[PDB]
């Protein structure tokens, strides 16, 4: 069974032994060299359409927490930008650090942010998420950096439910949450072809990483750091540093949406 994680003994440097694609040609995350990234005039406008998003539940899966959506219809979709067709929002989650100076998976000129939000979408031409992850254009993940400063009001409902899903396998109702409250003002982005950043590390993701970080408060991120990787009644292992470091860019170019 799966026993990968983020510790010294089962962390990112070990993953390749059970998931050899860990050493593949389009792995994520990557460092975004802002000087080398080139503006691409072929990019169409990005369209984030979350008006009808229907959140359902929040789950601690022992690696992060997922806010899950009803993706049985096109209720919240991502389109445009580098994408051909329609990608349906299925969940969002975060990666974060033990300290404010680390936590993000993507880096920007080697800068690490305190955390990174991933809004995960699947290409509806493949019918279901499981089929989509087997395709090179199966997923689109919208990545948003978090820095510590002023509180993000739209994050607080998430923060306040975390006490109820402290340990692996716990879930709670999480209806009527509006993920639009997690976005920055600008939709300027970088994009490149990559992978899932956790096992199974499938090379099925078009990454769209927003240039503008959101600000969250220290109190908000401190509450992320009180979660547990372990299950109930097991010795406490704080859920911190659940990020994979940057991987080799290989034969890829990062494109910018903005001149």
Ligand X SMILES: CC#CC[Se]c1ccc(S(N)(=O)=O)cc1
Nearest by Cα to 139 from 72, 191, 96 = 191
CB 242 within 8 A of CB 178: no
Q: Tell whether residue 7 is a contact of ligand X (CB under 6 A).
A: yes
Look-up of token digits 């509806």: 124
Q: Tell whether residue 118 is a contact of Zn ion (CB under 5 A).
A: yes
> For residues 165 and 202, which CB has a smaller minimum distance to ligand X in the complex?
202
Q: Which residues contact 35 (CB under 8 A, 6 or more apart)?
A: 109
Q: Tell whether residue 121 is a contact of Zn ion (CB under 5 A).
A: no
Give the tokens for residue 153: 């009001």
CB of 118 to Zn ion, least distance (A): 4
72 to 41, 63, 149, 175, 218: CA distances (angstroms): 34, 25, 37, 15, 36
By rule CB under 6 A, what string of x and - marks binding of each residue 193-212 to ligand X? ---xxx-x-x----------
CB of 142 to Zn ion, least distance (A): 11
Given the residues 14, 63, 106, 121, the one annotated as active site: 63
Quick one: residue 243, left, alpha or beta (phi over 0 = left, psi -120 to 50 = alpha)? beta
Q: Tell whether residue 24 is a contact of ligand X (CB under 6 A).
A: no
CB of 21 to Zn ion, least distance (A): 16
CB of 170 to ligand X, least distance (A): 18
Give the tokens for residue 16: 């390749």
CB 49 within 8 A of CB 89: no
Give the chain's largest Cα–Cα span: 54
What residues from 128 to 147 belong to the interface with ligand X (CB under 6 A)?
133, 141
Q: Tell whether residue 245 is a contact of ligand X (CB under 6 A).
A: no
136 to 105, 142, 235: CA distances (angstroms): 21, 16, 39
63 tagged catalytic: yes
Look at residue 3 and give the partner it binds from Zn ion, ligand X, none, a contact being a CB closer than 5 to 8 Å depending on partner kind. Answer: ligand X
Segment near Zn ion (CB under 5 A), from 15-23, 55-63, 111-119, 132-140? 111-119
Nearest by Cα to 226 from 171, 157, 167 = 167
C-alpha 133/C-alpha 219 separation (Å) is 35
CB of 7 to ligand X, least distance (A): 5
Q: Which residues are catalytic?
A: 63
Contact positions vs Zn ion (CB under 5 A)? 118
Contact positions vs ligand X (CB under 6 A)? 3-4, 7, 9-10, 14-15, 17-18, 118, 120, 133, 141, 196-198, 200, 202
- Residue stretches of the annotated binding site: 93, 95, 118, 197-198
- Residue stretches of the annotated binding site for Zn(2+): 93, 95, 118
């Amino acid at each position: 069974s799966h026993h990968w994680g983020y510790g010294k003994h089962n962390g990112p440097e070990h993953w390749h032994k059970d998931f050899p694609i860990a050493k593949g040609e389009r792995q994520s995350p990557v460092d975004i060299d802002t000087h080398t990234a080139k503006y691409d005039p072929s990019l169409k406008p990005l369209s984030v359409s979350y008006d009808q998003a229907t959140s359902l539940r929040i789950l601690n899966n022992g690696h992060a927490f997922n806010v899950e959506f009803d993706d049985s219809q096109d209720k919240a979709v991502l389109k445009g930008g580098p994408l051909d067709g329609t990608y349906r929002l299925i969940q969002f989650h975060f990666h974060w650090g033990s300290l404010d100076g680390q936590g993000s998976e993507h880096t920007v000129d080697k800068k690490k942010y305190a955390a990174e939000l991933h809004l995960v979408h699947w290409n509806t031409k493949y019918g279901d998420f499981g089929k989509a992850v087997q395709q090179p254009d199966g997923l689109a993940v919208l990545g948003i950096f978090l820095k510590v400063g002023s509180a993000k009001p739209g994050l607080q409902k998430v923060v306040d439910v975390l006490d109820s899903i402290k340990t692996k396998g716990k879930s709670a109702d999480f209806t009527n949450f509006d993920p639009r409250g997690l976005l920055p003002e600008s939709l300027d982005y970088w994009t490149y072809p990559g992978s899932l950043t956790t096992p199974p590390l499938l090379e099925c993701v078009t990454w769209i990483v927003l240039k503008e970080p959101i600000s969250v408060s220290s109190e908000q991120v401190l509450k992320f750091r009180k979660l547990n990787f372990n299950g109930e009644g097991e010795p406490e292992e704080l859920m911190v540093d659940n990020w994979r470091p940057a991987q080799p860019l290989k034969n890829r170019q990062i494109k910018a949406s903005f001149k």
